[PDB]
Symmetry: D3
Amino acid sequence: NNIDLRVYSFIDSLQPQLASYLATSSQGFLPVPGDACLWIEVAPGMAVHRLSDIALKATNVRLGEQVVERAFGSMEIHYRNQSDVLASGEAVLREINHAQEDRLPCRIAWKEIIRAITPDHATLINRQLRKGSMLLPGKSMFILETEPAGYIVQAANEAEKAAHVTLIDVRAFGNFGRLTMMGSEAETEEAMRAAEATIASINAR
Amino acid sequence: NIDLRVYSFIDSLQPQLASYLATSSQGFLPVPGDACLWIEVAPGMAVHRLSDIALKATNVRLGEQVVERAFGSMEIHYRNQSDVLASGEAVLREINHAQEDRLPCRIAWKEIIRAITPDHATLINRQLRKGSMLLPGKSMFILETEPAGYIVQAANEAEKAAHVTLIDVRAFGNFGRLTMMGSEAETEEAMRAAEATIASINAR
Amino acid sequence: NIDLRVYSFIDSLQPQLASYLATSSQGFLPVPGDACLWIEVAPGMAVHRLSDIALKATNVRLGEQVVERAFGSMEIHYRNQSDVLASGEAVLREINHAQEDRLPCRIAWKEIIRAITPDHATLINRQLRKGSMLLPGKSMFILETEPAGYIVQAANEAEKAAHVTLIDVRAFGNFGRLTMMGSEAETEEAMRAAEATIASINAR
Amino acid sequence: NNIDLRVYSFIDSLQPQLASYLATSSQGFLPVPGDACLWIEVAPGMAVHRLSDIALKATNVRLGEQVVERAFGSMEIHYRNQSDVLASGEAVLREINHAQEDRLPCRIAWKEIIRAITPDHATLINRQLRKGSMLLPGKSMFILETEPAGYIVQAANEAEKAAHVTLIDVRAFGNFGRLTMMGSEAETEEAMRAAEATIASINAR
Amino acid sequence: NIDLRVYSFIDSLQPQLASYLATSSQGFLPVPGDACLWIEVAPGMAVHRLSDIALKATNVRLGEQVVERAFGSMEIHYRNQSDVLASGEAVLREINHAQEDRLPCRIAWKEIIRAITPDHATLINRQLRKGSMLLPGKSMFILETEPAGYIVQAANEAEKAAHVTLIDVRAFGNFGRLTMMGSEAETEEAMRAAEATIASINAR
Amino acid sequence: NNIDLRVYSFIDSLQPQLASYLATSSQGFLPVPGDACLWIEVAPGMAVHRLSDIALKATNVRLGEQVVERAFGSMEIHYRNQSDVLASGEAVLREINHAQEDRLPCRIAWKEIIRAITPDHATLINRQLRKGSMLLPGKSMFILETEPAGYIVQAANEAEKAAHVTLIDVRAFGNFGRLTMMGSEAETEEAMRAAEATIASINAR
């Protein structure tokens, strides 16, 4: 029709903490470490229904997320094998007549390491809809925020793959994605460069 | 002072619709047959004095009351039509608007999706679904309106004119959204009733 | 050193049951036609080791795992009857018990209430049902068994046999609960099937 | 950075009902009657992470609230000793290079008393996200809405202090702060007078 | 074969009680001045039927309906005393019990705690409190009854007799619990009224 | 005043992850790492009200948990310095007239390390009332069940002291206490060794 591709973001193999987080937090069918994964945001939001039905029928792919927000909607599919995910992705692009590149770039609205987290700051992040692991006092904190939000998952994945960090929280919905990780001062800075390179990769497309 | 955005009067509520309202409302629970009046005004803080007025006028019961970012919704209902309409005219008289000064009802989505898969059916059933269970194999009617509250009258008629099942009605925020299930033939007919109901709202 | 409370096998999940566990389970989700298996052992904490044993033996998925006070519940499921049966036999070998060492399924309530009041339907819908809404004027069948886990299989053969609407299944704790809706002829036929399944089970 | 000061609201002594409301609706460390309190809203909202770390390391103050919204974010510190609270306050002000007066003015969105509340009106307010006390039918109802949201906590403290009213609810996030208090006609009238007197003092900055 | 566990008749609801019930009840909601009736029966599941009869009898609404593992609780209420008394008499004739057949109300706890510390008020406030806020420095009446259904009538009389504030009345389970705030004098009056009400109840 | 003493467990310094878990799910004042901690279960469980008033009113101690159940009640107090916690203990103990050894023995109802946790099994543990860190597939899992429940907190404390494990969960209320810890095959057996150790002492009363 007139569907704007806003996020197309593809992870070929989910890192273990990231998949575990999606499994625990997800309202749909659950992924496990190693599953390929496709995140998509389109506008208008309601178009997520037709596209999800198209994606689910083409392959053996399973639906992980589906949400209709005000201006846009989000869907995520995932399968043990890369093939089905990209095969369903093509279907979605061919139906909306968009190339992947027609996607929106990924603004970095906040990127920061915070060293020596107080126990009060940690307690606060840990009580507020925290579905991942416990942020612990004294450790360092990578925090990142993007616009659009869907990209935070892939950023989060490359962070974990590149650095011995612990995943605290991935908020992938709404207008702004947000990723919180914990680790030593040195681990978290590795996590940050990678995620910045991953973001660098997307923008060039 | 006050602007009237939604004014949607339902003279008698279909059983599923009323049952769903009763199952999700945090007010006084409607039953099938109840008359029912949806009103959204702006600023949102006004529904307080406005609900006070409607409630003090008649024997009518308050079903909903939400004050949102830019506007608020209020919902009254009673087994006697005249009580609901009487409260309605009283609310209009306070804000000094005619039932016609409401915003038109724009359609932001109308679609049927045939042969729903299990996965797609479950995601819907698992997230904010307080109605009945969407089942794989059936066709899905989905309807989105701006402003939201009109979706209730559209949901009500579509249950009258067609043999469909209520999955979900979300009547708050900027966008109303509706999900009904059934045979391709049923859900197409449920779409026409909603298309018609909206058209009559547009005539104001 | 473990006692085998519930063993219950379902070769092919009825659609509405699969959609209900899919919408209410905190594990991996089933689709219609899936094969399913329900286990309750005592001590309760035995379910972890057994879920490890069963998950490793095949491609089967884990739909529920709950350690309760007296005992512990677990539910595996797969698209093929073979992986479900293969994993259940492994769990039997490990606890050193045959399938018929399970406890009998005691019916502790069975009743059909025709012409459900709207108030009565409204209360049942509000109190945490994840299924379909109980509509007023229709007939209700409620059943309750001890132990709970069998209720899922009774819910399954009841949908197999009768054109009812599932409303609520509760498979954890001491007593299981089934809630169905339909016409009198529909609800009567389901209660008959459900009764028949439980007699089947009690033959071991 | 280019951090923006939106709300700087200092309370010297927390009123009992208000302290008790915050101890019940907040997800941090909890306040008691008499604690000094400071509420800061800054833009962009991810900045509240560094600013909070700065505050907990400067003094012994504790963290009550920490919330990141899309365009802005909000924090709240408190300690028995007002010293520590204003000290931690100045440390935040130095990092953002903003004086207290640089804060946004408090505009009144809504300001109403409604007499003789019906039982149905009362119930819906009691049933939706109210964490203060029950609103009873017959009594009068004072409702105040302010923009930005953070100053509603200072109006709520001054209202409770000046008049014998009951706190029903204070919502201090989003764009608009909303406050619900119950009393007689006279009690809510005094409370409403105290509210606007505090908003005007603030707006002298 | 139904055992009358509780039968507690409230002629008229005090506003904090009525307000509390309306904010925490999952069913239809009361207002100050309604009559109101609590019933516990065994077995639990018998409450559906007994709700069914009570609603048919008069114009009474259904306030609460909860099926515990061993017993079940229902709550009907109406603006007028006539309809509650009549609808309850019908419940009694069905189960073939007089009101006297109800279980004596025992007091498992009755205590005032004066000058409540902040951390104590805060823990009570945050954990399942739907009444008004408990503030520090004040006195706290707590009462625990067995059976639980009576704590509601003890909460009515206590509020009626003292100038106290209602914090919580949890009326399900085996144990009733009441929490109320006030000066140490008002809480001692609220407790003595409660004590007397139970005495009057077991006088029959 | 006829009060049974069911659990009396003193924790001299809360290990970091355990303090952080209590903090995420505590509904009183939150403990920070390093705090001392005293868990008490008494029957009739309505008695924890006075016993918390006594304990609070005697020292700087803070109330972290308090619950009334059918057969008993549980309270927990905690503070920066151990002197206050222990003193409040004696105030409590003398108020109910029992000594520290009048506590029930702590029977170990289940103890197991399960190696190579599958993703499915890890996911379902993560989805159900999990408020610690993510259990991750392939790692080993320590599980512990005690009766009464309050001791699982010292067992969890000690098992974090002696071992380099991760805390996933600790259900410290009801009849039975349940504890889920993660690590390699070496870290979980050490933790379990600490766990058996600490209970052995508790059983000497």
